[PDB]
Design a protein around this ligand. Sequence first.
Ligand SMILES: *[C@@H]1O[C@H](CO)[C@@H](O)[C@H](O)[C@H]1NC(C)=O
Ligand SMILES: *[C@@H]1O[C@H](CO)[C@@H](O)[C@H](O)[C@H]1NC(C)=O
Ligand SMILES: *[C@@H]1O[C@H](CO)[C@@H](O)[C@H](O)[C@H]1NC(C)=O
Ligand SMILES: *[C@@H]1O[C@H](CO)[C@@H](O)[C@H](O)[C@H]1NC(C)=O
Lengths: 209, 204, 209, 204
Amino acid sequence: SWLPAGCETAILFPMRSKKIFGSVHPVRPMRLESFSACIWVKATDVLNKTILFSYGTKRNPYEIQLYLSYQSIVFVVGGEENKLVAEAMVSLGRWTHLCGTWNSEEGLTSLWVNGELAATTVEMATGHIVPEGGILQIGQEKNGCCVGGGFDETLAFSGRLTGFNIWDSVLSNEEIRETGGAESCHIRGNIVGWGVTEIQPHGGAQYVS
Amino acid sequence: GCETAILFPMRSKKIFGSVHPVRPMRLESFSACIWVKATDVLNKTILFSYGTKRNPYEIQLYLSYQSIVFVVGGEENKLVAEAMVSLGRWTHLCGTWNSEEGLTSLWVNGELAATTVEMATGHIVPEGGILQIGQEKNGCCVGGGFDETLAFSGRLTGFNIWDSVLSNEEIRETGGAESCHIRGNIVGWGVTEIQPHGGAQYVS
Amino acid sequence: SWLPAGCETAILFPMRSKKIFGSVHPVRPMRLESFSACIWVKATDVLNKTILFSYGTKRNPYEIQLYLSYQSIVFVVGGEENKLVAEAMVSLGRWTHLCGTWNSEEGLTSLWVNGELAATTVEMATGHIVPEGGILQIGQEKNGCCVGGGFDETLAFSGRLTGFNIWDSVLSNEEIRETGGAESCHIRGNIVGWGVTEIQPHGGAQYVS
Amino acid sequence: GCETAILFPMRSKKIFGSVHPVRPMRLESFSACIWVKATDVLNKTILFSYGTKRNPYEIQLYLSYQSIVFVVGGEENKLVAEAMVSLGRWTHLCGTWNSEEGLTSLWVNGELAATTVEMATGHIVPEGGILQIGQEKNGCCVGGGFDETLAFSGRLTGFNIWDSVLSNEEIRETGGAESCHIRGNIVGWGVTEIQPHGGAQYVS
Ligand SMILES: *[C@@H]1O[C@H](CO)[C@@H](O)[C@H](O)[C@H]1NC(C)=O
Ligand SMILES: *[C@@H]1O[C@H](CO)[C@@H](O)[C@H](O)[C@H]1NC(C)=O
Ligand SMILES: *[C@@H]1O[C@H](CO)[C@@H](O)[C@H](O)[C@H]1NC(C)=O
Ligand SMILES: *[C@@H]1O[C@H](CO)[C@@H](O)[C@H](O)[C@H]1NC(C)=O
């Protein structure tokens, strides 16, 4: 069970279902004006839309998203209208490193894979800020589980995660390249870190340390 | 029968109720009645809510300091009845909606309280939502919980939802002594499944 | 089963044990400079020391207490050094009404039963302040429900409780007499009230109509 | 055996470990060693604590940004070793106490680090306390739980407590490659019961 870096803490999603997902509980509020989020992934199968991590309040279920689709990756911020698609990036069955970015001052969006720029644009959700007090999850969208499940079966994820880090400010180009190193496990953000901030798996999600 | 009434002894971040109607809830004109004996009322106190993923305020009936507010379609649509709630004693809250011209009217204790027109005219209530009692739709799972100030504090009974507008004769008949055997076409008291959670308990 | 007032929510403590107690979760902080408590009780048996409600931080387990002892009732605030005892107030098997009081400005202490003053004194815990962030419980000491931590058996309580209200200021003499009425449980305090503030029974403690 | 170990993947508000020693914990002179590989170090992160109802700080070993602090008796008594903790690497923390004259010394990696005298002389550690790992003493079901900042974040192994002050020869022998089958006379690794809670889990 090799892992990208010295990390020995990787969540495992055996098989998609309507009750499999992970939760995150940031210590500090999620009010963001410009955020950078990176995450490793070893996807097993990709459907029309597979969620890796998603943030959404009660009145807006797509405040933030980053999902795969066949051979493309999509980054959604602010709402369902905004998007950014990189083509022919992810290969099934191999580890890879994904990283986004955003800036509310000018609405500039970016997306990196394996430390090399893939797709970028400008004027995305300009003049917008993500409200605090929402709900964050990894591998699933924002849906209830108190009664009758609710998580659509096709949107779940199956594979491995690690190094899930969310900053709260724009990063540097060199730094985004560094986190993909072979011994970069000891680099963490200030909003959510790996192995520090609470992450509670549910419904079969299990650590594979 | 008139032998049961859900109890809400406290307000917290985990207390709520859930309902599981059988038939699809997508309706054009309906009517919902309920019995409320509120122990204490804040600015907002939900009795029964309804919302989808993209809409949390499809149907609501939330209390105020002294007024009952009926919301259909969304937040921006409101209807307020001023001074007909009294803590510590039973009362009959029930509202009526008609989508043909957005006609709306709120029936309290068997007497018309307020009425308006052109409220969500033509809007169709979608299905696939979650129908709760005493708590607004919010995070079901362990992700915090519902907003504390919204939860209910008291007892409830006789939750009914009809599939068609009700005549002025029908509403009065539901407020009678023996009305408890009357049940709604979509949701019926003592028939539809109810699962109190997080402290709330039945009372016989 | 008759109840003192028109209320219909009385907690039941069937039999004492090492895992029977009630918890309270005040909405607002417990930092108190002068507090007035209150409680209805129908005790079944009284041991050397039976607790009704107790508040204690991590570094001090006896910030506030009110326990029975045979025919006497004790009120402890600040620590074991402070105390106040009435002689023969309590009678087993019948409902009764108990109230406390305290003032940090001078240290005046009082205690009422059924609206008639029983014992009163001054100069205890003078110039004292109760720190916030503690743990509050009804009917048991502050030991810990945690595995490996068990409440001492003899200190538990068995009977009925209702109208548990904790104010945050000294009351009026007439008001203290009012709450003992036969239809007066519709008046409640602010720090804790009966029927609004969370009260979670544990280990067999059960609500009753 | 040293194959196993405890894991603390996150410093939440409910994560801790508990220990249940067999013999009474009332001791006059003792010695405790443990293996720590801290993922992240804060102003104060408890490794293993011990306290009674009146006394919550009978024995403790809490880390600082670069220092390790040994406490016996309460807050007023302390002992600090400055700059001998490295994140991401194994290290061997262990200390000794002698109540006859309050003689204390802290052994790190098998070499003396700091020493003092009159460290709470004559005081007798009482029994009846609660012995935890990675978290301070406090309620878990009521009042939320423990204090978040105190909780640990990393892995631990080889928790041992002895019943007599060790000699300079014994301490080094515990740091050897084959040392891991050695166990203390009060709490031994891999024999004493351990019940991780709130997300903690073993690792093999
Ligand atoms: C995937 O989603 C796109 C969204 O535009 C849709 O056009 C396409 O038909 C979908 N394919 C499926 C569900 O197989
Ligand atoms: C509830 O009512 C007022 C308006 O009537 C609202 O603005 C506020 O949120 C609540 N009032 C208070 C005093 O909190
Ligand atoms: C309570 O404690 C003693 C034993 O410690 C017990 O025998 C007696 O009933 C009570 N004595 C006093 C002084 O309260
Ligand atoms: C860390 O703790 C020391 C006391 O040991 C204190 O002086 C200092 O301000 C603390 N720093 C932070 C960042 O909490």
